[PDB]
Design an enzyme around this catalytic site. Structure first.
Site, PDB file in Angstrom:
ATOM      1  N   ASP E  61       0.824  -1.193   0.000  1.00 48.80           N
ATOM      2  CA  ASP E  61       0.000   0.000   0.000  1.00 48.80           C
ATOM      3  C   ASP E  61       0.865   1.253   0.000  1.00 48.80           C
ATOM      4  O   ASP E  61       1.868   1.319   0.722  1.00 48.80           O
ATOM      5  CB  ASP E  61      -0.933   0.008   1.218  1.00 48.80           C
ATOM      6  CG  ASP E  61      -1.972   1.102   1.144  1.00 48.80           C
ATOM      7  OD1 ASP E  61      -2.905   0.967   0.325  1.00 48.80           O
ATOM      8  OD2 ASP E  61      -1.865   2.088   1.903  1.00 48.80           O
ATOM      9  N   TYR E  63       1.640   5.541   0.495  1.00 48.21           N
ATOM     10  CA  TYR E  63       1.709   6.363   1.698  1.00 48.21           C
ATOM     11  C   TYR E  63       0.763   7.545   1.536  1.00 48.21           C
ATOM     12  O   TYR E  63       1.033   8.466   0.762  1.00 48.21           O
ATOM     13  CB  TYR E  63       3.147   6.801   1.938  1.00 48.21           C
ATOM     14  CG  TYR E  63       4.059   5.621   2.188  1.00 48.21           C
ATOM     15  CD1 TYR E  63       4.151   5.048   3.450  1.00 48.21           C
ATOM     16  CD2 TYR E  63       4.799   5.057   1.152  1.00 48.21           C
ATOM     17  CE1 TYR E  63       4.975   3.962   3.683  1.00 48.21           C
ATOM     18  CE2 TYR E  63       5.619   3.970   1.374  1.00 48.21           C
ATOM     19  CZ  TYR E  63       5.708   3.428   2.641  1.00 48.21           C
ATOM     20  OH  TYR E  63       6.527   2.346   2.865  1.00 48.21           O
ATOM     21  N   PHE E  74       8.076   0.572  -0.555  1.00 46.16           N
ATOM     22  CA  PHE E  74       8.749   0.813   0.729  1.00 46.16           C
ATOM     23  C   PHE E  74       9.579   2.096   0.715  1.00 46.16           C
ATOM     24  O   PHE E  74      10.606   2.189   1.392  1.00 46.16           O
ATOM     25  CB  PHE E  74       9.623  -0.380   1.144  1.00 46.16           C
ATOM     26  CG  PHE E  74       8.846  -1.613   1.520  1.00 46.16           C
ATOM     27  CD1 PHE E  74       7.496  -1.544   1.836  1.00 46.16           C
ATOM     28  CD2 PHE E  74       9.474  -2.850   1.552  1.00 46.16           C
ATOM     29  CE1 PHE E  74       6.787  -2.684   2.178  1.00 46.16           C
ATOM     30  CE2 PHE E  74       8.773  -3.995   1.895  1.00 46.16           C
ATOM     31  CZ  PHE E  74       7.428  -3.911   2.208  1.00 46.16           C
ATOM     32  N   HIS E 184       7.286 -10.439   8.170  1.00 45.39           N
ATOM     33  CA  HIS E 184       7.200  -9.116   7.579  1.00 45.39           C
ATOM     34  C   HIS E 184       8.316  -8.234   8.140  1.00 45.39           C
ATOM     35  O   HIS E 184       8.746  -8.421   9.281  1.00 45.39           O
ATOM     36  CB  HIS E 184       5.828  -8.513   7.880  1.00 45.39           C
ATOM     37  CG  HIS E 184       5.419  -7.415   6.949  1.00 45.39           C
ATOM     38  ND1 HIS E 184       5.760  -6.097   7.149  1.00 45.39           N
ATOM     39  CD2 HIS E 184       4.689  -7.446   5.809  1.00 45.39           C
ATOM     40  CE1 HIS E 184       5.265  -5.362   6.171  1.00 45.39           C
ATOM     41  NE2 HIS E 184       4.608  -6.155   5.346  1.00 45.39           N
TER      42      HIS E 184
END
Lengths: 220, 116, 79, 219, 220
Positions: E61, E63, E74, E184
């Protein structure tokens, strides 16, 4: 065993889990009874060839009773009274094939010469016991077969019904092939979707998107 | 669906305004005879809003309340400013001293008076 | 005439590090009192709704310290 | 637990890693007592050493929430429902356990001991009284020691208040606070109640715990 | 946009969901604020080429805050204080790279010229909102990119950490590539496995099983 199947399946041996498979299951044959013998594991690689494979139908668990199964998925011996989910896929066949003939038995020696890959995922389980074994090597031996057919052979189809078949062969492309999934053929499958869908045309019909060797369902 | 007007399209009269200031990325003009429409279109939009005899306890928007007339069709557009018209709140207050330089400012906050 | 005292206490200037010095510690006690079923599931529920945005990172230290206080207050010796 | 400092400089002037509940000494405040489990430690403030740790393995009640306190004459300690004469480190009199949670408190008259709902004597050790409306409530007295406050610690916590008298223990009022009472402190000069109440329903996942100040004696 | 990337990505357009994507998200740009603009979606297809792709790292997802992200997974802008999971993968880098230098920021313009495919799965989401959108077409547009690289380009690796990356690219073969997965990189990931694993050697080390263009982590 069929030699032309292993034209390029020589990359099935040299992995750390293969000797884990053919020795320990043979060791399970040297202590217990795993139900299908070695002369029924190799039926799918003998009766049909690899040159005409057009339908890919998986199979989760074999039939733990004595004198029932013979290697192919969703399949059972001819003197056995026919299994209910195979009796359940017959119901849609009447509603789509107008010339519906009846098999009267449970041996699937009629559709095997068509172009259907009636493969069990785990080929052998024990007698009178369903899911006793661990992942002894039957899974990835087939995982190296299913996704290998994404390279060489062509014209497949994925009726991966049930969540056990969804994990194995989902991500194969939709330009070269066609993937249509629905609820399980068993009547123990409360969330519906299988109960009237007309997927069984799309063996005869999705090959019109390819143009390969034809199919008749009625070879029974 | 496709609720269009029988008169001239006021949303196209607003969209044609929307292609001027959004293309005013310091183009070097003064929007004070064009932003009168930002007070003139909505008061034309207010002049027809009295037709339905409204209930005056409406501190919300007709975009939430009344989708039948051209007020709520247009208030949702220029309230959903995408943090771009919200710079003009910062621009024409922090950098506003001249009377034309407030003319594009003080007429227009009361043009978003329910939106304020 | 009350003079509130000068805040010369333990400060926490690396807030991106002091969280990392303690978010493991917030996990280092909740596993010592609770099964990991709710721990990953509530951590997933905020990560589907707050993500990797620090708005779940402090917010899990909200929810974990809000439960570990009251679970040591209701009258369970561990849980 | 940390003895901080609040003159003008804020620092941990002495540190403890052990006790779940620390408490001062009442009249002469040079002593801080604290209790872990069933073990209660007496500390000084000047040097912070262990002054005298008092415990008798043959005699403890093993309450769930033990909180050793002092009498207002700074001579008796209620650890595990046992009195303790602090002149020579001896035990005096075990009480009879009844309610599995609360280790007791001193009444400000210096004449009684209030275990959870049983009212005792300090010199004859006779059960004077038994107030069943004191069923598992934490008690707070006035600074003059003329009224007792009650907040339920029952799962909900504190659906109301509980106003008691300090002489005859007659209930004055149970005012209905619809939320859940979590903590309660009062003034020295008898004008406000510090009340930690929780908003929403009984939700352990979402706690909106606010502070609401009441005024004493106003309709 | 990079043209040589679309040497054979012309089979990305003609599907029923592509016009669903570039019009409605543009319609979401004509009403709302989806956060990354069109001139930051195309950074991964501009800065690196397709001729040197060696690491495949997905991204779930974007930001949602204003002036944070710039398209790569990331990843975040350089004046933004660095994100915690990207601050969390730095911890293993010290324990494996003896010459550990520090980035000091959040722009990932240093590893992008190495051979890492820092791809977000859904490239755009709204401002101040995490997962508002439905499957408007960002998924299968990338699913037709990831498994397409199983054909033409070569030398990849799958550190598909987290169950969101496990569903997308698991079944790609292990003869041609190497797939290693763990917990993760976020510290919100209670079931451990990431917390000390030394996977970050196996960008430098699994290419010794291939022999392609090298990597240095320390380009920061």
């Amino acid at each position: 065993f069929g030699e032309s199947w292993k034209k390029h399946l020589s990359g099935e041996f040299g992995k750390p889990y293969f000797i884990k498979l053919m020795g320990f299951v043979a060791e399970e044959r040297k202590h217990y009874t795993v139900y299908p013998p070695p002369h029924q594991v190799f039926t799918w690689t003998q009766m049909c060839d690899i040159k005409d494979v057009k339908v890919v139908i998986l199979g989760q668990d074999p039939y733990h009773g004595p004198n029932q199964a013979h290697g192919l998925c969703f399949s059972v011996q001819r003197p056995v009274p026919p299994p209910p989910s195979l009796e359940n896929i017959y119901k849609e066949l009447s509603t789509d094939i107008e010339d519906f003939v009846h098999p009267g038995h449970g041996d699937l020696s009629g559709w095997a010469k068509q172009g259907v890959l009636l493969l069990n995922a785990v080929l052998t389980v024990r007698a009178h016991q369903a899911n006793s074994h661990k992942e002894r090597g039957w899974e990835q031996f087939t995982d190296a077969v299913v996704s290998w057919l994404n390279q060489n052979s062509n014209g497949l189809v994925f009726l991966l019904w049930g969540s056990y078949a969804q994990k194995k062969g989902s991500a194969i492309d939709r330009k070269r092939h066609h993937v249509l999934q629905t609820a399980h053929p068993s009547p123990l499958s409360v969330y519906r979707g299988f109960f009237g869908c007309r997927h069984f045309s799309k063996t005869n019909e999705l090959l019109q998107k390819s143009g390969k060797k034809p199919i008749d369902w009625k070879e029974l | 669906m496709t609720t269009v007007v029988v008169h001239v399209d006021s949303k196209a009269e607003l969209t044609t305004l929307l292609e001027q200031w959004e293309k005013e990325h310091g183009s070097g003009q003064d929007m004070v005879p064009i932003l009168t429409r930002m007070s003139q279109l909505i008061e034309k939009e207010t002049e027809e809003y009295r037709k339905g005899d409204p209930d005056p306890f409406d501190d919300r928007h007709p975009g939430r309340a009344d989708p039948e007339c051209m007020l709520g069709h247009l208030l949702r557009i220029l309230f959903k400013n995408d943090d771009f018209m919200n710079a003009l709140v910062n621009a024409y207050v922090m950098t506003s001293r001249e009377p034309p330089l407030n003319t594009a400012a003080c007429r227009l906050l009361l043009d978003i008076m329910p939106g304020l | 005439m009350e003079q509130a005292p000068e805040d010369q206490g333990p400060q926490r200037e690396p807030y991106n590090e002091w969280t990392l010095e303690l978010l493991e510690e917030l996990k280092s006690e909740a596993v010592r009192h609770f099964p990991r079923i709710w721990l990953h599931n509530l951590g997933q529920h905020i990560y589907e709704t707050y993500g990797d945005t620090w708005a779940g990172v402090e917010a899990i230290i909200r929810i974990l310290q809000q439960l570990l206080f009251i679970h040591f207050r209701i009258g369970c010796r561990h849980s | 637990s940390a003895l901080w400092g609040m003159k003008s400089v804020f620092d941990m002037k002495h540190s403890f890693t052990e006790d779940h509940y620390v408490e001062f000494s009442k009249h002469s405040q040079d002593r801080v007592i604290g209790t872990k489990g069933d073990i209660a430690h007496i500390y000084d403030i000047q040097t912070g050493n262990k002054l005298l740790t008092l415990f008798n393995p043959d005699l403890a009640n093993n309450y769930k929430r033990n909180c050793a306190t002092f009498n207002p004459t700074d001579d008796l300690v209620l650890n595990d429902g046992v009195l303790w004469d602090v002149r020579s480190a001896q035990a005096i009199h075990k009480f009879d356990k009844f309610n599995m949670n609360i280790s007791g408190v001193f009444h400000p008259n210096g004449l009684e001991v209030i275990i959870n709902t049983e009212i005792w004597d300090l010199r004859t050790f006779h059960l004077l009284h038994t107030v069943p409306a004191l069923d598992q409530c934490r008690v707070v007295f006035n600074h003059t020691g003329t009224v007792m406050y009650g907040a339920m610690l029952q799962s909900p916590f504190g659906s109301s208040f509980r106003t008691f008298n300090a002489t005859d223990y007659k209930p004055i009022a149970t005012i209905d606070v619809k939320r859940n009472i979590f903590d309660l402190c009062t003034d020295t000069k008898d004008c406000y109640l510090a009340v930690i109440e929780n908003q929403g329903s009984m939700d352990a996942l979402n706690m909106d715990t606010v502070c609401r100040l009441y005024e004493v004696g106003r309709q």
